[PDB]
Write a protein that binds this ligand. Structure first.
Ligand SMILES: Nc1ncnc2c1ncn2[C@@H]1O[C@H](COP(=O)(O)OP(=O)(O)O)[C@@H](O)[C@H]1O
Ligand SMILES: Nc1ncnc2c1ncn2[C@@H]1O[C@H](COP(=O)(O)OP(=O)(O)O)[C@@H](O)[C@H]1O
Ligand SMILES: Nc1ncnc2c1ncn2[C@@H]1O[C@H](COP(=O)(O)OP(=O)(O)O)[C@@H](O)[C@H]1O
Lengths: 20, 721, 247, 20
């Protein structure tokens, strides 16, 4: 639900920072 | 059900694991959902699942922090389940571990836990261990108390507390700063090969004791000092859990007669008692050197004692002995016979990609400035090994530290965490360290996959296709060669004018095939001839076998024939000392080793015809001077990285440079660049290379290949029909 | 305030310290003014400040004699302040050190202290150690008694006395004839490179044991015999204070 | 003061003799 969706956005953003 | 194999992760994020999309649909979870992992000893961990294009469908990729929290190791199997009802917490109490916070004081929250937790939305469970890097320290923390239970997600308004004494580490909990697989940068191919050999008998001893197939008992690692031979041996033992016993030459040889042999025997006895175990013998050449090189009673006895102890591994079940040497032929050949040390791995020297990985590993704890470019450093650090890149990072850190320490003047027993945490290491400090560093492998043979691709070679469209047929087909479609009774060619000779891309062709095909490229240049063939050391050819071809798949390129194949007089020559014939050893090694090389031999000459009329017979360089490709459409492609390739102005007409230049070789077009490109630099520097005492710079370059550039030499190549090509 | 890093001096004169012009304006002192330097263990020294074109803006350049009087070492930080009310004295009593006057006798004033003091206008403080060279000997003296206190300038009419037994050297006071950096001539580039490698972990051990960066552990010096390989190793140990073990 | 100015002239003169 919403708390998992906020963690989803944060995990995806950190992954993109490491891949770029 | 839902039981996946634990694999290694690429994403180092402690709160994230990777699962392949098909498992997201079998587990009915969405990208970024929060899941629980079921480990060992009734333990579990909570993390976020992301997708990628590299995770195996049946594996879960997690880092060391998650595996330790689950008390699992690589190769184990854990269960995965979603938990969509995870909520956020309000209070989390975190304390450092006593064994990691030492000598450093300050506000741990502001330095470490605040940037780790704040707005990160990390799932946190009671009892989790996690690592926060910064201030040139790696500090691990444990979560001891939370308001929600058993786990929650950190919210932007979650308050982090830290009061109380540091936590004493549990005896069954390994420190996160121990050597593991994520501490090794380059040489990934060698690490994977070793893991296959050792992890199975060490993690599954019940398999080998119950079957007729014997495990590997001894693995010899070789390469220059400072390449990670010990780092791998430690990473393997720490990742599998095998008991690690360290041996080194100096420790054994420093002992008196009767003590060195006894201590060596004890090491094997201790490993057996603690089996499964790994015995690592560093500087093996110091204990058991080639017999011909020693005559002392102590050295002869310790050779015999090591040989008998290695043979005793038939009874010492689940003990693997690893050794490190500089060269596989520096030690007693008996050690390498069936049994004992019958497996070998060539660690070599990290390439440009591996060097970048090593620099990234040894800077994990360092705060880098925005101007730091470690890829630029990795490309400049030619000839360095991991030990030298680690020293380079250390020197860069110390230079940055001195600059600040002399200004703040804070002298105490401990260091302020905030002072180090705000210290950024700039590119000037890495460049300074590079000037101070001195490569330990500067003159070692360089074996790596070349960065040259087909896009870098203008023209020669038909040669590009031909080389793919010669090099790829024998291994991509081996069933057709057997079907038609075809014997694949072992190599090809390039001939033609100088500076037409013969070297790039060999590199580009090695690159596309992802094969190691070994470059032998004229001066090396001449060195062997002049010094009467042609025996070294055997080591060149043996390196090609060790590095296989690879492409072994012999440039300037006529260098010796020319050194012998070339056009007139001396009193002998075409054969010479070095080419004969090349011919011998080629005849003894099988196509099953995936080693392709390429030669190049600028004077095919003086190449020993023996090299062109079936079984040798039987294929011959002519590389002509580029035509008009190719010269345009060459100019674009050579200028691909230059800031060329839009007014530069490269097609016009190609029309004028009718007789120019590719190397001659490069001189024009570089000469125009030099002129642009001269003007740019003067303007400060310009943003692009202008038409005037290329026009002035044309005033000096000339063709290097005359019509007399073009006919020489045409006549040879005509002779070949 | 007014806390500057102690650096090496080019001018060997024991009564002269070099500061860069911008610090003369921050301290509001004129070229050649007399200043006090605050060292360690509640000790101080008095000297004349001159300017040059080589001193770093944030450093004070002083020789070995001044550093030993302040009980400081290269890389430390000391305070500088002007003392514009300094006057000259009439009587100064100076005695030699027992460990430096040996095998040599004569009129110490006429040989050493007279050309050192007479018309030199040197600032002198009670307890100062200074070195006078001549006669192929290097003889150090200590100032024990003066009429003005705590310090004064030597005037052309100041009478210098020297009566009594030689002074026994203190166990915490190193002799000025020990090997230091000012005993090394050429190869300055190598000495600077070595100092960077060794002085930091030796003077600031708390830095390295508190960080993840490892110090250099072994330095190999090479070159022909007689080039100063041992001279450097001794100078480094004596200047930083590290215990020196010879093999 | 003037006693410091007398020391100033003496220190400056010795420095010039060593530099020349
Ligand atoms: N491939 C590599 N990746 C990361 N670090 C490396 C690598 N190769 C060497 N190093 C580093 O260089 C050093 C190698 O020293 P060590 O393993 O003791 O080698 P040796 O057996 O030659 O003494 C270590 O600090 C290690 O971390
Ligand atoms: N076909 C080509 N495309 C692009 N560049 C070329 C080409 N031929 C030659 N050059 C330029 O000439 C230089 C020398 O080429 P190389 O193949 O090393 O010569 P050789 O094989 O005779 O040693 C290269 O650096 C390259 O930039
Ligand atoms: N660069 C130098 N500056 C000053 N004196 C030097 C220098 N190099 C050598 N010397 C002098 O020469 C001698 C060198 O001897 P020593 O340091 O013992 O060298 P070694 O290690 O070869 O025995 C000493 O008397 C030293 O003062």
């Amino acid at each position: 639900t919403n708390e998992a969706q906020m963690a989803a956005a944060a995990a995806l953003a950190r992954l993109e920072q490491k891949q770029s | 059900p839902n039981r996946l194999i634990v694999d290694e992760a690429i994403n180092e994020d402690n709160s994230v694991v990777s699962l392949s999309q098909p498992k997201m649909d079998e587990l009915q979870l969405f990208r970024g959902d929060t899941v629980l992992l079921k480990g060992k000893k009734r333990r579990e961990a909570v993390c976020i699942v992301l997708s990628d294009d590299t995770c195996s469908d049946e594996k879960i990729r997690m880092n060391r922090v998650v595996r330790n929290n689950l008390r699992v190791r690589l190769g184990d199997v854990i269960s995965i389940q979603p938990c969509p009802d995870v909520k956020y917490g309000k209070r989390i109490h975190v304390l450092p571990i006593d064994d990691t916070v030492e000598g450093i004081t300050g506000n741990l929250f502001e330095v470490y836990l605040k940037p780790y937790f704040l707005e990160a939305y990390r799932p946190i469970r009671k009892g989790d261990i996690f690592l926060v890097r910064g201030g040139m320290r790696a500090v691990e923390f444990k979560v001891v108390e939370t308001d929600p239970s058993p786990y929650c997600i950190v919210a932007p308004d979650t308050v982090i507390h830290c009061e109380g004494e540091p936590i004493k580490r549990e005896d069954e909990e390994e420190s996160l700063n121990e050597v593991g697989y994520d501490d090794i940068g380059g040489c990934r191919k060698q690490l994977a090969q070793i893991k296959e050999m050792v992890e199975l008998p060490l993690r599954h001893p019940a398999l080998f004791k119950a079957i007729g197939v014997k495990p590997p008992r001894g693995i010899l690692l070789y390469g220059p000092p400072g390449t990670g031979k010990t780092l791998i041996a430690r990473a393997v033992a720490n990742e599998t859990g095998a008991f690690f016993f360290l041996i080194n030459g100096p420790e054994i040889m420093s002992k008196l007669a009767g003590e060195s042999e006894s201590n060596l025997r004890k090491a094997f006895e201790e490993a057996e008692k603690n089996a499964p175990a790994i015995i690592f013998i560093d500087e093996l050449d110091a204990i058991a050197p080639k017999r011909e090189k020693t005559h002392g009673e102590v050295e002869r006895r310790i050779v015999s004692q090591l040989l008998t102890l290695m043979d005793g591994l038939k009874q010492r079940a689940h003990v693997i002995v690893m050794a490190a040497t500089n060269r596989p032929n520096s030690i007693d050949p008996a050690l390498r016979r069936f049994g004992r040390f019958d497996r070998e791995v060539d660690i070599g020297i990290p390439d440009a990609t591996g060097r970048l990985e090593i620099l990234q590993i040894h800077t994990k704890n360092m705060k880098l400035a925005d101007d730091v470019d470690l890829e630029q450093v990795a490309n400049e650090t030619h000839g360095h090994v991991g030990a030298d890149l680690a020293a380079l990072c250390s020197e860069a850190a110390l230079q940055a530290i001195r600059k600040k320490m002399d200004l703040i003047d804070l002298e105490d027993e401990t260091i302020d965490a905030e002072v180090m945490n705000s210290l950024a290491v700039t590119m000037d400090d890495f460049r300074w360290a590079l000037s101070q560093s001195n490569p330990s492998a500067l003159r070692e043979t360089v074996v790596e996959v070349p960065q040259v691709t087909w896009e870098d070679i203008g023209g020669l469209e038909d040669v590009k296709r031909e080389l793919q047929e010669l090099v790829q087909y024998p291994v991509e479609h081996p069933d057709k060669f057997l079907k038609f009774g075809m014997t694949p060619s072992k190599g090809v000779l390039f001939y033609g004018p100088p500076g037409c891309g013969k070297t790039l062709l060999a590199k580009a095909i090695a690159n596309e095939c992802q094969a190691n490229f070994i470059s032998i240049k004229g001066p090396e063939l001449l060195t062997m001839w002049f010094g009467e050391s042609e025996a070294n050819v055997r080591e060149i071809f043996d390196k090609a076998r060790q590095a296989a798949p690879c492409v072994l390129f012999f440039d300037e194949l006529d260098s010796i024939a020319k050194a012998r007089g070339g056009n007139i020559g001396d009193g002998g014939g075409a054969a010479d000392r070095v080419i004969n050893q090349i011919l011998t090694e080629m005849d003894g090389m099988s196509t099953k080793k995936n080693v392709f031999i390429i030669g190049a000459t600028n004077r095919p009329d003086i190449i020993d015809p023996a090299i062109l017979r079936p079984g040798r360089l039987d294929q011959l490709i002519y590389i002509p001077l580029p035509d008009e459409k190719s010269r345009v492609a060459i100019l674009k390739a050579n200028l691909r990285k230059s800031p060329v102005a839009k007014d530069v007409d490269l097609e016009f230049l190609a029309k004028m440079t009718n007789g120019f070789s590719g190397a001659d077009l490069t001189e024009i490109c570089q000469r125009a660049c030099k002129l642009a630099i001269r003007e740019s520097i003067e303007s400060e005492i310009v943003p692009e290379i202008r038409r005037d710079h290329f026009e002035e370059a044309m005033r000096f550039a000339r063709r290097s290949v005359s019509d007399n030499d073009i006919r020489k190549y045409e006549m040879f090509a005509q002779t070949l029909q």
